[PDB]
Design a binder for this molecule. Structure first.
Ligand code: HEM
Length: 145
């Protein structure tokens, strides 16, 4: 049910993955500046320059498309989630806590831009908690605690 609650507000997100994607990453980098340094292509870009950066927004669209494709799965997502754990642990080298940070940003962006109400905020936290716990379990299988 929590997946359905999120999907009932996904329309504004999917309508403009570039704009919403850029909002998410801009906010992430502003509020959690250590996360910017985990993107070598973006690390060192002055904060004031991020909101207008088309490459940042394009990457944010990639992220949100993948999250959309994890929703329109409603829990049965191992063929999507295992590769994401693999690349984020072994290629991008992203500590697990950073997924919690981007999830908090997404909740706020959806509250502001997508009509996600109090119950929907809780639903999204629940869904992101499922996703993050699966990433973490996969990280452990790879040797990353
Ligand atoms: C649930 C949230 C996230 C999703 C859905 C997601 C999704 C993606 C996807 C689909 C890609 C491209 C394919 C791949 O490399 O695996 C990617 C790349 C990447 N992600 Fe994530 N990601 C998430 C969170 C994060 C976080 C929190 C960080 C760092 C703080 C991060 C850092 C990266 C980096 C550095 C790349 C490579 C960018 C490039 O070289 O072009 N990701 N992510």
């Amino acid at each position: 049910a929590d997946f359905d609650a999120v999907l009932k507000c996904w329309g504004p997100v999917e309508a403009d993955y570039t704009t919403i994607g850029g909002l998410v990453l801009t906010r992430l980098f502003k509020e959690h500046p250590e996360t910017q340094k985990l993107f070598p292509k973006f690390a060192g870009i002055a904060q004031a320059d991020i909101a207008g950066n088309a490459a940042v927004s394009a990457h944010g669209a990639t992220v949100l498309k993948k999250l959309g494709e994890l929703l329109k799965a409603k829990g049965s997502h191992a063929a999507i989630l295992k590769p994401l754990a693999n690349s984020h642990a072994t290629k991008h080298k992203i500590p697990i806590n950073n997924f919690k940070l981007i999830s908090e940003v997404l909740v706020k962006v959806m509250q502001e831009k997508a009509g996600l109400d109090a119950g929907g905020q809780t639903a999204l936290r629940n869904v992101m908690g499922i996703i993050i716990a699966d990433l973490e379990a996969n990280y452990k299988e790879l040797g990353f605690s």
